[PDB]
Design an enzyme around this catalytic site. Structure first.
Site, PDB file in Angstrom:
ATOM      1  N   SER A 140       0.846  -1.181   0.000  1.00 51.84           N
ATOM      2  CA  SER A 140       0.000   0.000   0.000  1.00 51.84           C
ATOM      3  C   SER A 140       0.879   1.227   0.000  1.00 51.84           C
ATOM      4  O   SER A 140       1.949   1.203   0.579  1.00 51.84           O
ATOM      5  CB  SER A 140      -0.841   0.041   1.258  1.00 51.84           C
ATOM      6  N   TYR A 153      -0.986  -1.058  10.222  1.00 52.24           N
ATOM      7  CA  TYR A 153      -1.261  -1.505   8.862  1.00 52.24           C
ATOM      8  C   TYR A 153      -0.134  -1.105   7.941  1.00 52.24           C
ATOM      9  O   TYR A 153       0.433  -1.948   7.248  1.00 52.24           O
ATOM     10  CB  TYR A 153      -2.581  -0.888   8.381  1.00 52.24           C
TER      11      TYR A 153
END
Lengths: 259, 259, 258, 261
Positions: A140, A153
């Protein structure tokens, strides 16, 4: 058929990006195994994809479950060629570092970093037996550029990026490729962050909009395919140049338009 | 002196690099606190460091113990200006992806990733109360380029690099800087027992200075990044690796062939 | 047909990578314009590609000539969609920094940096008029990792990597994407000192050098609507050349000994 | 002190960052040579630095002139240890790609890319004679992160980062280090005549310390990388930009929004 005959596993298969990916990979000739948690409509997902698609539960926190998934693929098709490690945990209490709890942190690493590692641990020898193969890991943009949430995350995505280089390096000699995709903002149901935060992000993508699931599916398909046989150990941003430009560009443009 | 009247925590202080960082920081004017596991000789390190250096045990796998370290420092000096998150676990069974066990993975992630996060969790509030401060987190070349060992270790250092960005972005408006160092190969007692000499020598050739690093050469960078001279450097990952990764692989064999 | 209906221009079209990129794009359904220097056998390259491929000379050192190429494509096909900036000058006197002559440096920059910019300068307004399009710039792994030769060349590819971001940034709002590809070692005629080629081969993770088609496929993908959300990127087609610690093969051999 | 007895050439020494880097290197004990174009006030700049600083004209576009600057330093001091390639041309006509002229481009590359290669070309042999030495090349945040102006400038800087990697790799063996620094917005006299304030204020909010840099914050990083404290740092590009490129674009307005939400 870009993936003619290959056997593909996609994790997080009931998710926005996961479903679309399974679709694109099937469409390109792959026999897709959809995998996600037991609470999800895996069967509806697989029915929708079609093209021989099958499904099996997986719980990335559980080494035996991760193993059962790969072994099911081998029971069903006799081989494994492709894996999209797309699944990811994101706790809504994943905010600031000073606010981080060990539970939020550990839950997120267990699924994302450890689980993806386990998926690779058990996929690799199957890829080697097949005569070579491809793993695509979903990272990401958040691993590369920070903000006031998703610290855990983000950091797990960073772990996965390095994990991509290790798989590529250790198993290149046996015919295995591994790459990662760092998506920018993509229109999902796990989105549908509030609207004005989305609007803000949108102005900083260079297309002037957030991504669509299929725009990630198409890179997965390509990186999973033989057309990418000289591409390995890379992290490729599918983010409309989010990080390719100086920040403050949209308001500098508005400012220049005034002055 | 570069760190006049600054209070500094060095974790992994009994190790090669940590002990040496402790010397340079205290030599640059800091009131240093040496922290490491209870079976290590903290007394001896503090003695050898001198200059009013103290010591306090810490177990990175345990938030209580982290909480206790930060508070000791504040009870003792009343302020905290610098943290060097230098401690790192590195298991000898940390080999190939396919050989990974969850125990080796989690031991490593608990010390390196989670531990560093816990250290930032409790240090940040105190640095803000100082009126700003610095955190230096140690990473590793291996996060950026892979080999057939240290996968877990490598992935945890990736995680700390992103963490470093998140700490910088989140607490820059409150006067906290955070940077990471990525060492090349560095001559330590860990290193001599980890790698045999022929392989160390091979690595030495791929450093542009034709030699591996010395601990004090990492310590000086820590010292500069913790000092007010680095006022405008935050959120970066800086390689101290003799350009290990700045040159095409195969260079020495190319050069040998040219001679 | 991944590029059905698109018009593409490929520079350095007679070269190994340029010719084989031309076939692939054509096979994808693009109408391709092969461009190279007047002393290269353009007609034969265009013949070998077939599928309606046309050709036209260009000298990337000359602005008028770049204009003439864009205008030829527009007057022929009425549009432009894709530009693969593949042409590159690579001087053999391009060795060490302390041996560098201004001639070699300037010659290399004029073609590679200035030349790529001029192609973009005049393709951009056309891609804009086509509703949007894609540009692909060929860099080199040598821009991110040095050796004892090709100093000017690598430096020009870095400039090209920056140009790519500018193009993608300045003209994204108007529908233009721009990405760069950094190849490892690829098999061409320009390539063919064998002892060096095999040393490099051991450090690609496939354990071989690249094939031109393997760069072509990536240009093709990046020029297509499938890459609609990728822009401003530099992507390595180098089989992990820089994803592993150097010394790996030699470490593995030592471990096969002890 | 950190650069005791070391001889340092600084290009662009009359400019905001150059003049201040000269003082800092000199405060750190270096014998400094200020070098800039003949129309700048080198005499005034060296008088300001003091500590035995000397000055000498250079035109990066002229190979004979670059060589004459190196030959002068050796003539005066007998050695060379440190070069700070700080000089950069930067032309207000350097706006968008579609608007780039060959002259703006070429003028920028002749000074920035070619000039810096010539400085190293003539300096490196002297760094080797002195038993090794350090080059520091000044780059820019703008080679990594694009915007609506300074295309050419930004491409030359990219060239200079790769150049840095080539010097470092080719001459590491002979004791020569080479690194580059990529600054963020720094308060100089040229930004006061370059970008307007409301644009400076926008940029300022995207630098994590909530402000533009000062020239000394660059000077200190040059000082360190030129010294023997950086012996195992080579071939790198280090950003002194308050993390301008470590955060998500739009952070400040996301924060403004989240506070209202």
């Amino acid at each position: 058929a870009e993936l003619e005959n290959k056997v593909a596993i996609i994790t997080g298969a009931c998710g926005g990006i996961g479903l679309e990916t399974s679709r694109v990979l099937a469409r390109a000739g792959a026999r897709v195994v959809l995998a996600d948690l037991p609470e999800t409509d895996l069967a509806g997902a697989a029915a929708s994809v079609g093209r021989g698609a099958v499904h099996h539960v997986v719980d990335l926190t559980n080494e035996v479950s991760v193993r059962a998934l790969i072994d099911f693929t081998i029971d069903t098709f006799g081989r494994l060629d492709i894996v999209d490690n797309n699944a990811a945990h994101s706790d809504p209490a994943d905010m600031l570092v000073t606010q981080m709890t060990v539970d939020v942190w550990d839950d997120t690493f267990t699924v994302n970093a450890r689980g993806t590692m386990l998926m690779c641990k058990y996929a690799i020898p199957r890829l080697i037996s097949a005569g070579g193969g491809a793993i695509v890991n979903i990272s990401s943009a958040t691993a590369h550029a920070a903000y006031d949430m998703s610290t855990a995350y983000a950091c797990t995505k960073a772990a996965i990026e390095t994990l991509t280089r290790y798989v590529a390096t250790q198993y290149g000699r046996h015919g295995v490729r591994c790459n990662a995709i760092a998506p920018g903002l993509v229109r999902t149901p796990r989105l549908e962050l509030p609207q004005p935060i989305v609007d803000i992000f949108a102005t900083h993508h260079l297309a002037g909009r957030i991504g669509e699931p299929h725009e990630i599916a198409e890179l997965v398909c390509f990186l999973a395919s033989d057309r990418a046989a000289f591409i390995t150990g890379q992290v490729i941003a599918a983010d409309s140049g989010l990080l390719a430009h100086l920040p403050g560009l949209p308001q500098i443009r508005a400012s220049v338009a005034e002055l």
